[PDB]
Amino acid sequence: TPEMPVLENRAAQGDITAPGGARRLTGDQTAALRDSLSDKPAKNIILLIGDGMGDSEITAARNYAEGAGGFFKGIDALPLTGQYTHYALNKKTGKPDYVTDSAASATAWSTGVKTYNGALGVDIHEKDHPTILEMAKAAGLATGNVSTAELQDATPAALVAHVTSRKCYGPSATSEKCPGNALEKGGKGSITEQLLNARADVTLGGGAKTFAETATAGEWQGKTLREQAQARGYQLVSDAASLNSVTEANQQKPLLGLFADGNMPVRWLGPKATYHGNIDKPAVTCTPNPQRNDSVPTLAQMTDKAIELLSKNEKGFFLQVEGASIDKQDHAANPCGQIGETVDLDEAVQRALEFAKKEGNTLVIVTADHAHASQIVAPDTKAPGLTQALNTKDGAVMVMSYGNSEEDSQEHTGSQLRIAAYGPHAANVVGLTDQTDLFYTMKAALGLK
Amino acid sequence: TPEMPVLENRAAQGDITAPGGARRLTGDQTAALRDSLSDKPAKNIILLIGDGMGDSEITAARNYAEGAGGFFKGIDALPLTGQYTHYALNKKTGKPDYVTDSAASATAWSTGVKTYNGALGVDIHEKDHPTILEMAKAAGLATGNVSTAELQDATPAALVAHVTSRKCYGPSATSEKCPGNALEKGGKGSITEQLLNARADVTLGGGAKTFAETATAGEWQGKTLREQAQARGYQLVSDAASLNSVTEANQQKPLLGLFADGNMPVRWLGPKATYHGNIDKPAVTCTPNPQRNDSVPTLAQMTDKAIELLSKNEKGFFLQVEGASIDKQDHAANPCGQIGETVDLDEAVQRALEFAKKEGNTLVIVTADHAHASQIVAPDTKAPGLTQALNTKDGAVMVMSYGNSEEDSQEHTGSQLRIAAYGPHAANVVGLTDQTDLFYTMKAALGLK
Ligand SMILES: [Mg+2]
Ligand SMILES: [Mg+2]
Ligand SMILES: [Zn+2]
Ligand SMILES: [Zn+2]
Numbered sequence: 001t002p003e004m005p006v007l008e009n010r011a012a013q014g015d016i017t018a019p020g021g022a023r024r025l026t027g028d029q030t031a032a033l034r035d036s037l038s039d040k041p042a043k044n045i046i047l048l049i050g051d052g053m054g055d056s057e058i059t060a061a062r063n064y065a066e067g068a069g070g071f072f073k074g075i076d077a078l079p080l081t082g083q084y085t086h087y088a089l090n091k092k093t094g095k096p097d098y099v100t101d102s103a104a105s106a107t108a109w110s111t112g113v114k115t116y117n118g119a120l121g122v123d124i125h126e127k128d129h130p131t132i133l134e135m136a137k138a139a140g141l142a143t144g145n146v147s148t149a150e151l152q153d154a155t156p157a158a159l160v161a162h163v164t165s166r167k168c169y170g171p172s173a174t175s176e177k178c179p180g181n182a183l184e185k186g187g188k189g190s191i192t193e194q195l196l197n198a199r200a201d202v203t204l205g206g207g208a209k210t211f212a213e214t215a216t217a218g219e220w221q222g223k224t225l226r227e228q229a230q231a232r233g234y235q236l237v238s239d240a241a242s243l244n245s246v247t248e249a250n251q252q253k254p255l256l257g258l259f260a261d262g263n264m265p266v267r268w269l270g271p272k273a274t275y276h277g278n279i280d281k282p283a284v285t286c287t288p289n290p291q292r293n294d295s296v297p298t299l300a301q302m303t304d305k306a307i308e309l310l311s312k313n314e315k316g317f318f319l320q321v322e323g324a325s326i327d328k329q330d331h332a333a334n335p336c337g338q339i340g341e342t343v344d345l346d347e348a349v350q351r352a353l354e355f356a357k358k359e360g361n362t363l364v365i366v367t368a369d370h371a372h373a374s375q376i377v378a379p380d381t382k383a384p385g386l387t388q389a390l391n392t393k394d395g396a397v398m399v400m401s402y403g404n405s406e407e408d409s410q411e412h413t414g415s416q417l418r419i420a421a422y423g424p425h426a427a428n429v430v431g432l433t434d435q436t437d438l439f440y441t442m443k444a445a446l447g448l449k
Numbered sequence: 450t451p452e453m454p455v456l457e458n459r460a461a462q463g464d465i466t467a468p469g470g471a472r473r474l475t476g477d478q479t480a481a482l483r484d485s486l487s488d489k490p491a492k493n494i495i496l497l498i499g500d501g502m503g504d505s506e507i508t509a510a511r512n513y514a515e516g517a518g519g520f521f522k523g524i525d526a527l528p529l530t531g532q533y534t535h536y537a538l539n540k541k542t543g544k545p546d547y548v549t550d551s552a553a554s555a556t557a558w559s560t561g562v563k564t565y566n567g568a569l570g571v572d573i574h575e576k577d578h579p580t581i582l583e584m585a586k587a588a589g590l591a592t593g594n595v596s597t598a599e600l601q602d603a604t605p606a607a608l609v610a611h612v613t614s615r616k617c618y619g620p621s622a623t624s625e626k627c628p629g630n631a632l633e634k635g636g637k638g639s640i641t642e643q644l645l646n647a648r649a650d651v652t653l654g655g656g657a658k659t660f661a662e663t664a665t666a667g668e669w670q671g672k673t674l675r676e677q678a679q680a681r682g683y684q685l686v687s688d689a690a691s692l693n694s695v696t697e698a699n700q701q702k703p704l705l706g707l708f709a710d711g712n713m714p715v716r717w718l719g720p721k722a723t724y725h726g727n728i729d730k731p732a733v734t735c736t737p738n739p740q741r742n743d744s745v746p747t748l749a750q751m752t753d754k755a756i757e758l759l760s761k762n763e764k765g766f767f768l769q770v771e772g773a774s775i776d777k778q779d780h781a782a783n784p785c786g787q788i789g790e791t792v793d794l795d796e797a798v799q800r801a802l803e804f805a806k807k808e809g810n811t812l813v814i815v816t817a818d819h820a821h822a823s824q825i826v827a828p829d830t831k832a833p834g835l836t837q838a839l840n841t842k843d844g845a846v847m848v849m850s851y852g853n854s855e856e857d858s859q860e861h862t863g864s865q866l867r868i869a870a871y872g873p874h875a876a877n878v879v880g881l882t883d884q885t886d887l888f889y890t891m892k893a894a895l896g897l898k
């Protein structure tokens with residue numbers, strides 16, 4: 001529908017050195033904005049998550065790939081924008097914990113309740129709360145869960161599992177780490193077991209490794225999680241062609257793609273940032289990963305296939321898409337890997353917007369779970385941490401800094417960050433909101449109960 | 450009458466540990482955002498700048514002062530939000546320079562042209578460009594320029610001075626650093642001399658010190674700039690009482706308030722962050738600065754009196770207000786100073802909004818010139834830079850981190866950041882925009898040719 005606009009061009013209008021040449025706007029937006037506003041219900045929801053993708057991450061990615069005055073055709077094209085809060089809680093005390101982990105934040109948008117770092121789908125009392133995915137299914141909508149990380153990862157795990165600890169990937173760890181959730185101890189089972197019972201129509205990502213584990217109890221005791229899966233009607237695909245083979249996906253034949261043992265591979269490679277690296281070493285140009293593969297679907301590809309299959313459902317669908325590795329490359333102080341995963345997410349965002357523009361009843365949301373370490377600093381900066389100078393598209397140098405940990409891993413940060421939307425009920429992300437509001441916004445746009 | 454609504458309250462609505470209690474919204478926002486869209490002309494503009502106040506700095510201050518689930522009645526109350534970019538240019542190459550200084554960014558919103566770091570009111574070819582203030586004056590509107598910094602400082606100076614270097618405060622530095630601008634070499638003069646020529650209606654801030662230099666040429670050669678101001682008809686004020694006593698300010702009797710020799714004193718005192726400060730040290734609680742004073746007007750007081758005085762002009766007014774010290778205390782790695790200056794600006798923002806809701810034809814914008822160093826990290830963080838633990842309003846600890854410089858001053862950062870607005874034409878701040886679009890937005894909102 002030409003009905004709801006998406007920003008087609010927010011790139012610098014001309015010569016950046018000239019008056020007005022760096023403007024991104026061509027004229028007054030009031031009218032386009034009014035036209036972007038609708039309280040009609042949403043038929044479908046597409047939620048795209050850049051893990052650790054705060055404003056700095058987006059800017060850095062844009063500067064590198066599109067140039068300072070460039071524009072991300074997906075990420076930057078959502079018309080309605082705001083800033084949201086993602087603080088977690090201290091388990092003991094119930095008081096805010098300013099810097100969340102990936103499990104607590106995902107639990108927030110998936111269930112509408114704040115929790116402690118490490119928790120999945122449970123509150124500070126270890127009590128279960130239904131996820132939006134479970135809710136959609138209950139209502140008859142098609143449901144999809146897509147990520148580039150292991151499927152047991154906090155991010156996608158959060159829609160289908162309720163455990164006291166995120167580490168409880170499979171039976172083995174669970175019995176150790178989440179006794180109360182251990183299938184045998186009467187619990188609901190490990191993340192993977194819970195994933196299997198959740199039965200989303202479409203689930204694609206990595207983490208095949210854990211499906212090799214064997215059940216300690218239940219109907220499928222003694223057999224592998226993969227066998228349990230085939231035994232349950234799941235359709236197991238492991239590569240792009242097999243995924244492409246796919247013509248239908250539903251409750252009779254849910255789809256389960258396991259494209260890697262661990263996390264899917266990153267798009268781009270570069271060296272790790274080093275002490276005084278912008279000073280002592282030469283500017284870097286990122287290298288595409290030669291081992292990413294033609295047999296491995298990209299996020300944009302999983303995205304497109306997910307949309308085709310779920311769109312068959314007349315009642316509608318809920319779809320979560322995660323660009324997982326932005327966060328992990330940020331933790332590794334790897335500018336190139338971080339940037340590449342952001343550009344990768346932008347493509348998927350483009351696919352989503354393409355569909356929603358045509359479809360007309362789709363709310364598309366782009367945001368992150370929390371902020372991260374990466375900072376853009378001056379070229380001749382002398383920093384106490386890890387730095388790297390990069391060669392951008394503008395043909396100039398950009399320096400990135402990771403100065404929040406002396407440990408082998410750079411930390412998340414608590415800054416509020418960008419949330420953006422297009423479609424019905426998108427006004428709900430404008431201004432200041434909390435991460436928990438996202439849950440009530442989605443539940444309400446769909447009319448779930 | 451709130452023709453157009455402001456966000457009355459977006460704090461957490463209830464118990465933050467229970468389902469839905471961390472929600473900032475109480476229902477759908479569509480209708481209220483529709484009600485925030487107006488393309489009517491604006492009569493007045495109030496531009497509020499938090500120097501160095503990126504999303505991180507707003508979050509940090511919110512957590513400390515209002516609690517994570519709190520809400521800044523000023524800062525967070527503007528309903529139309531976006532993110533903007535503020536990269537500068539390399540003088541030599543004309544290519545983007547990813548991390549701007551205060552001068553280049555101020556020049557950008559003030560004249561609509563990108564420029565090089567250190568420049569004020571000039572382009573990369575060192576050509577003068579008219580400022581939003583000079584333009585408003587020219588159209589017959591009243592003009593205000595308010596800041597807590599020295600008036601010679603980059604931010605306020607950008608509205609009235611055009612010099613090749615921000616360092617050209619008065620005659621002496623100008624002669625040495627901006628020979629082309631030096632009065633004695635036939636130039637337009639020092640920042641201070643050009644401020645006196647610009648003759649805005651109301652000018653309030655610090656920097657009385659430079660007013661003690663003598664002119665090297667012109668009609669007031671040999672006299673101090675303070676004597677020149679007196680000769681030129683400016684009303685000079687230097688304390689809260691004398692400012693309060695002012696009933697008029699126009700081209701005939703322009704107001705010049707100089708409340709400090711350098712920058713105005715900061716609101717709160719606290720220790721500087723230190724290496725492993727969050728570990729080797731106990732939590733800090735900020736304390737009000739005894740030097741703050743009753744004879745020393747606050748930013749909210751300066752804001753209130755300027756609006757009073759400037760509002761007497763029927764054609765309308767342009768007012769810029771700067772919370773200068775957020776950036777300065779951020780460079781200094783001083784959390785309490787930084788946060789305290791952020792709370793201060795919020796107070797100024799409230800007055801602005803109170804007036805605007807009443808008036809109904811006023812455009813209010815709140816943003817920053819660029820991002821900064823400060824990061825909120827986990828309490829147990831082992832960081833390479835400077836840290837400090839703080840006791841917040843929630844009764845919990847928050848850790849702040851500064852790790853982008855090994856030098857004495859922490860550095861600006863290049864991330865895109867929040868811009869928010871209320872009033873006619875406020876829609877032009879939504880989505881992704883550039884800092885130069887802000888010039889075009891204000892020009893158009895005031896209907897300036
Ligand atoms: Mg994740
Ligand atoms: Mg300033
Ligand atoms: Zn995360
Ligand atoms: Zn992480």
Ligand SMILES: [Zn+2]
Pocket residue numbers: 500501550551552776818819
């Ligand atoms: Zn600044």
Ligand SMILES: [Zn+2]
Pocket residue numbers: 501551776777780861
């Ligand atoms: Zn600064």
